[PDB]
């Protein structure tokens, strides 16, 4: 259908959300749990917000989707110590993300 981009992105986002390393990214970061977070991280992003954006038909291009999801990882890696469990999850899930976007032919 015309929903080919939407269907592809929904599949990708769902697979990312089901991944066992996705648990840290599943909802917005809480100020209580992250001192200084919103002072350092200017464009917060999480997989719940991404799901809404997707449902709200925001992702009219592959580039808008890839930017949000990449941001989930890079925010985490800037904020957290390099050997933290969060930083480890980011890179695992990031590897999985780049493999899925390649599988789908979203990058050439």
Swiss-Prot record:
Sequence ranges assigned to domain Bromo in this UniProt record: 1-104
Outcome, altering residue 79 to A: Reduced acetyl-lysine binding
Tissues of expression: Ubiquitously expressed but most abundant in heart and skeletal muscle. Also expressed in the skin, in keratinocytes (at protein level).
Subcellular location: Nucleus; Cytoplasm, Cytoskeleton, Microtubule organizing center, Centrosome; Cytoplasm
Effect of residue 29 to A: Reduced acetyl-lysine binding
Disease listed for this protein: Defects in KAT2B has been found in a patient with isolated coloboma, a defect of the eye characterized by the absence of ocular structures due to abnormal morphogenesis of the optic cup and stalk, and the fusion of the fetal fissure (optic fissure). Isolated colobomas may be associated with an abnormally small eye (microphthalmia) or small cornea.
Function: Functions as a histone acetyltransferase (HAT) to promote transcriptional activation. Has significant histone acetyltransferase activity with core histones (H3 and H4), and also with nucleosome core particles. Has a a strong preference for acetylation of H3 at 'Lys-9' (H3K9ac). Also acetylates non-histone proteins, such as ACLY, MAPRE1/EB1, PLK4, RRP9/U3-55K and TBX5. Inhibits cell-cycle progression and counteracts the mitogenic activity of the adenoviral oncoprotein E1A. (Microbial infection) In case of HIV-1 infection, it is recruited by the viral protein Tat. Regulates Tat's transactivating activity and may help inducing chromatin remodeling of proviral genes.
Subunit structure: Interacts with SIRT1. Interacts (unsumoylated form) with NR2C1; the interaction promotes transactivation activity. Interacts with EP300, CREBBP and DDX17. Interacts with NCOA1 and NCOA3. Component of a large chromatin remodeling complex, at least composed of MYSM1, KAT2B/PCAF, RBM10 and KIF11/TRIP5. Interacts with NR2C2 (hypophosphorylated and unsumoylated form); the interaction promotes the transactivation activity of NR2C2. Interacts with KLF1; the interaction does not acetylate KLF1 and there is no enhancement of its transactivational activity. Interacts with NFE4. Interacts with MECOM. (Microbial infection) Interacts with and acetylates HIV-1 Tat.
Record family assignment: Belongs to the acetyltransferase family. GCN5 subfamily.
Free-text note regarding domains: (Microbial infection) The bromodomain mediates binding to HIV-1 Tat.
Name the record gives this protein: Histone acetyltransferase KAT2B
Full-length numbering of the shown residues: 724 to 831 of 832
């Amino acid at each position: 259908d015309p929903d080919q981009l939407y269907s592809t992105l929904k599949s990708i986002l769902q697979q990312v959300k089901s991944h066992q390393s996705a648990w840290p990214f599943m909802e917005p970061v809480k100020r209580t749990e992250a001192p200084g977070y919103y002072e350092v991280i200017r464009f917060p992003m999480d997989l719940k917000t991404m799901s809404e954006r997707l449902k709200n038909r925001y992702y009219v291009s592959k580039k808008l989707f890839m930017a949000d999801l990449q941001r989930v990882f890079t925010n985490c890696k800037e904020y957290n110590p390099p050997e933290s469990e969060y930083y480890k999850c980011a890179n695992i899930l990031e590897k999985f993300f780049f493999s899925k976007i390649k599988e789908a032919g979203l990058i050439d």
